[PDB]
Design a protein around this ligand. Structure first.
Ligand code: ZN
Length: 255
């Protein structure tokens, strides 16, 4: 599976039938239709104790992994029940500034989308959680092109070392707090993973407020390779899945 003409998103349903399931992601956030829910509690992000370990190029994006053996970096509150532990963060970008986000707002697409993945500690591990309807919580943040984002610079400078598929690099002491907008206002809906196996185990939390990155930061992303080292070079560009049918589901807003 991949993002090319022969293995792209239009093809995943052959191997992964849930691809046409009932609570697939991403989706278009219609702001006029989303329902203000007064019963939604503020998000609670506790990442001061986060421990980053490494960054790796898995052939479809680059995951920054964190030590999830203890409640060091957690998400709670909002529409969530229980404590969710931060396991990794990755991005989805495009070949041009006009595209790259997965989730769209009123049909508007952003240069990129940041996903912070967390799993419910009631399930013991990540593997058990993907098996549950309330097993994951993904904090989605959009990226627009403007001024640079200081907190993103350490990730950008290490890309060179993980250019191709299978590469990894020690990546300790990275603080994800540096990637958050000022406002924690959000939209939430029941969805799924946006890459195979597309398990319908996620409570999506999409931030209203986007973060701005400079043109050059985003450019360093576009230099990654889908291919392994020693193979023809395929730029990691447009690793995003098109919007899926909402299908009855409701998107609630915290504002
Ligand atoms: Zn993602």
């Amino acid at each position: 599976w991949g993002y090319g003409k022969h293995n792209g998103p239009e093809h995943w349903h052959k191997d992964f039938p849930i691809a046409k399931g009932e609570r697939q992601s991403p989706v278009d956030i219609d702001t006029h239709t989303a329902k203000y829910d007064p019963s939604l509690k503020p998000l609670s992000v506790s990442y001061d104790q986060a421990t980053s370990l490494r960054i790796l190029n898995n052939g479809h994006a680059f995951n920054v992994e964190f030590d999830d053996s203890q409640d060091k970096a957690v998400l709670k509150g909002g529409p969530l029940d229980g404590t969710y532990r931060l396991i990794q963060f990755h991005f989805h970008w495009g070949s041009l500034d006009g595209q790259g986000s997965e989730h769209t707002v009123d049909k508007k697409k952003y240069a990129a989308e940041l996903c912070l993945v967390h799993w419910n500690t009631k399930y013991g591990d990540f593997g058990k959680a993907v098996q549950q309807p309330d097993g994951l919580a993904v904090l989605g943040i959009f990226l627009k092109v403007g001024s640079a984002k200081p907190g993103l610079q350490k990730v950008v400078d290490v890309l060179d070392s993980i250019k191709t598929k299978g590469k990894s690099a020690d990546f300790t002491n990275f603080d994800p707090r540096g990637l958050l907008p000022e406002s924690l206002d959000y939209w939430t809906y029941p969805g799924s993973l946006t890459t195979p196996p597309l398990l319908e185990c996620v409570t999506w939390i999409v931030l209203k407020e986007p973060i701005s990155v400079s043109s050059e930061q985003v450019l360093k992303f576009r230099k990654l390779n889908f291919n392994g080292e020693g193979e023809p070079e395929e730029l990691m560009v447009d690793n995003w899945r098109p919007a899926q049918p909402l299908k009855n589901r409701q998107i609630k807003a915290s504002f």
